[PDB]
Amino acid sequence: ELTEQGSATIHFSTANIHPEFRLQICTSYVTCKGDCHPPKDHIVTHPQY
Amino acid sequence: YEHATTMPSQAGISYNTIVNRAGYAPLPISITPTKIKLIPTVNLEYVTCH
């Protein structure tokens, strides 16, 4: 959902330690970057998305 | 998660530390020694009186 002005949160799954991608929205192409960290669980009960 | 620290043996003084995971909220830890007892293993030899 999109409003006139504000902030929107998007949940994403990445395998990159240093992710940098081009998030495409209605028309814009935002460049998103950051840093990720290893998770707690050594073993989980679902396949990797 | 395995954390290790070294708290000085001083009763009545708190020891505050923090556990920082790579991408998780910090975890505060506090240890407050109210009393530290050193009890030697004593065996009776004999008893003396007047």
mmCIF file of C-alpha atoms in Angstrom:
data_model
loop_
_atom_site.group_PDB
_atom_site.id
_atom_site.type_symbol
_atom_site.label_atom_id
_atom_site.label_comp_id
_atom_site.label_asym_id
_atom_site.label_seq_id
_atom_site.Cartn_x
_atom_site.Cartn_y
_atom_site.Cartn_z
ATOM 1 C CA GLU A 1 0.000 0.000 0.000
ATOM 2 C CA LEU A 2 1.118 3.536 -0.820
ATOM 3 C CA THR A 3 0.115 6.863 0.739
ATOM 4 C CA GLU A 4 0.850 10.509 -0.028
ATOM 5 C CA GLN A 5 3.874 10.743 2.285
ATOM 6 C CA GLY A 6 5.494 8.440 4.795
ATOM 7 C CA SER A 7 7.531 5.275 5.260
ATOM 8 C CA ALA A 8 6.839 1.739 4.044
ATOM 9 C CA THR A 9 8.369 -1.445 5.451
ATOM 10 C CA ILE A 10 9.206 -4.431 3.240
ATOM 11 C CA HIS A 11 10.317 -7.857 4.453
ATOM 12 C CA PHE A 12 13.016 -9.473 2.324
ATOM 13 C CA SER A 13 15.281 -12.516 2.519
ATOM 14 C CA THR A 14 18.857 -12.373 1.251
ATOM 15 C CA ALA A 15 21.913 -14.619 1.293
ATOM 16 C CA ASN A 16 24.329 -11.699 0.844
ATOM 17 C CA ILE A 17 26.520 -10.586 3.733
ATOM 18 C CA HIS A 18 26.646 -7.109 2.126
ATOM 19 C CA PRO A 19 23.425 -6.709 0.117
ATOM 20 C CA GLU A 20 22.956 -4.011 -2.504
ATOM 21 C CA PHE A 21 19.993 -4.281 -4.863
ATOM 22 C CA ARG A 22 17.598 -2.165 -6.913
ATOM 23 C CA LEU A 23 14.165 -2.305 -5.310
ATOM 24 C CA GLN A 24 11.543 -1.562 -7.962
ATOM 25 C CA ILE A 25 8.331 0.135 -6.830
ATOM 26 C CA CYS A 26 5.359 1.513 -8.821
ATOM 27 C CA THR A 27 7.714 3.454 -11.100
ATOM 28 C CA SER A 28 10.913 4.293 -9.176
ATOM 29 C CA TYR A 29 14.085 2.194 -8.886
ATOM 30 C CA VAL A 30 15.443 2.759 -5.380
ATOM 31 C CA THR A 31 18.963 1.567 -4.554
ATOM 32 C CA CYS A 32 19.051 -0.266 -1.217
ATOM 33 C CA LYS A 33 22.259 -1.199 0.610
ATOM 34 C CA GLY A 34 23.302 -2.344 4.057
ATOM 35 C CA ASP A 35 24.960 -5.081 6.094
ATOM 36 C CA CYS A 36 23.606 -8.436 7.267
ATOM 37 C CA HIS A 37 24.670 -10.688 10.124
ATOM 38 C CA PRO A 38 24.705 -14.462 10.698
ATOM 39 C CA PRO A 39 21.518 -15.830 12.278
ATOM 40 C CA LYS A 40 21.110 -17.523 15.646
ATOM 41 C CA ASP A 41 19.912 -20.937 14.514
ATOM 42 C CA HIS A 42 22.388 -23.481 13.185
ATOM 43 C CA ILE A 43 19.516 -25.664 11.924
ATOM 44 C CA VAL A 44 15.944 -24.691 11.034
ATOM 45 C CA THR A 45 12.802 -26.495 9.855
ATOM 46 C CA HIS A 46 12.102 -24.692 6.566
ATOM 47 C CA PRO A 47 13.898 -24.511 3.209
ATOM 48 C CA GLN A 48 15.760 -21.378 2.204
ATOM 49 C CA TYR A 49 13.533 -18.832 0.478
ATOM 50 C CA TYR B 1 25.543 -18.680 22.854
ATOM 51 C CA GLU B 2 28.580 -18.986 25.133
ATOM 52 C CA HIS B 3 29.652 -15.816 26.947
ATOM 53 C CA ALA B 4 32.644 -15.425 29.251
ATOM 54 C CA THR B 5 33.565 -12.676 31.699
ATOM 55 C CA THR B 6 35.645 -12.056 34.822
ATOM 56 C CA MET B 7 33.973 -10.364 37.790
ATOM 57 C CA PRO B 8 36.235 -9.039 40.571
ATOM 58 C CA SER B 9 35.573 -10.674 43.942
ATOM 59 C CA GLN B 10 34.186 -7.670 45.824
ATOM 60 C CA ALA B 11 30.917 -8.020 47.720
ATOM 61 C CA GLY B 12 28.352 -5.243 47.485
ATOM 62 C CA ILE B 13 29.544 -3.875 44.121
ATOM 63 C CA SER B 14 27.504 -4.719 41.036
ATOM 64 C CA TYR B 15 29.053 -5.942 37.787
ATOM 65 C CA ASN B 16 27.178 -4.942 34.627
ATOM 66 C CA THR B 17 28.051 -6.316 31.195
ATOM 67 C CA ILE B 18 26.372 -6.627 27.809
ATOM 68 C CA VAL B 19 26.168 -9.438 25.249
ATOM 69 C CA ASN B 20 26.120 -8.168 21.662
ATOM 70 C CA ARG B 21 25.125 -10.570 18.925
ATOM 71 C CA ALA B 22 26.036 -9.652 15.364
ATOM 72 C CA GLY B 23 22.488 -8.722 14.366
ATOM 73 C CA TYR B 24 20.330 -9.008 17.485
ATOM 74 C CA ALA B 25 19.286 -6.772 20.347
ATOM 75 C CA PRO B 26 21.909 -6.399 23.105
ATOM 76 C CA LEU B 27 21.372 -8.505 26.211
ATOM 77 C CA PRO B 28 22.149 -6.876 29.586
ATOM 78 C CA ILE B 29 23.676 -8.964 32.375
ATOM 79 C CA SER B 30 24.145 -7.893 35.996
ATOM 80 C CA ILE B 31 25.824 -9.842 38.809
ATOM 81 C CA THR B 32 25.596 -8.502 42.370
ATOM 82 C CA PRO B 33 27.668 -10.401 44.973
ATOM 83 C CA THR B 34 26.036 -9.980 48.366
ATOM 84 C CA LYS B 35 28.424 -12.360 50.152
ATOM 85 C CA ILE B 36 31.453 -14.457 49.180
ATOM 86 C CA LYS B 37 32.278 -17.283 51.591
ATOM 87 C CA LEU B 38 35.509 -19.291 51.803
ATOM 88 C CA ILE B 39 34.940 -22.400 53.926
ATOM 89 C CA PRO B 40 38.011 -24.559 54.635
ATOM 90 C CA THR B 41 37.620 -28.279 55.250
ATOM 91 C CA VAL B 42 38.424 -28.543 58.965
ATOM 92 C CA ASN B 43 38.724 -31.772 60.942
ATOM 93 C CA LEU B 44 38.854 -31.724 64.729
ATOM 94 C CA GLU B 45 42.137 -32.818 66.302
ATOM 95 C CA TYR B 46 41.342 -32.444 70.009
ATOM 96 C CA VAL B 47 39.763 -30.151 72.600
ATOM 97 C CA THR B 48 41.503 -28.361 75.470
ATOM 98 C CA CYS B 49 40.204 -26.784 78.675
ATOM 99 C CA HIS B 50 41.288 -25.939 82.200
#
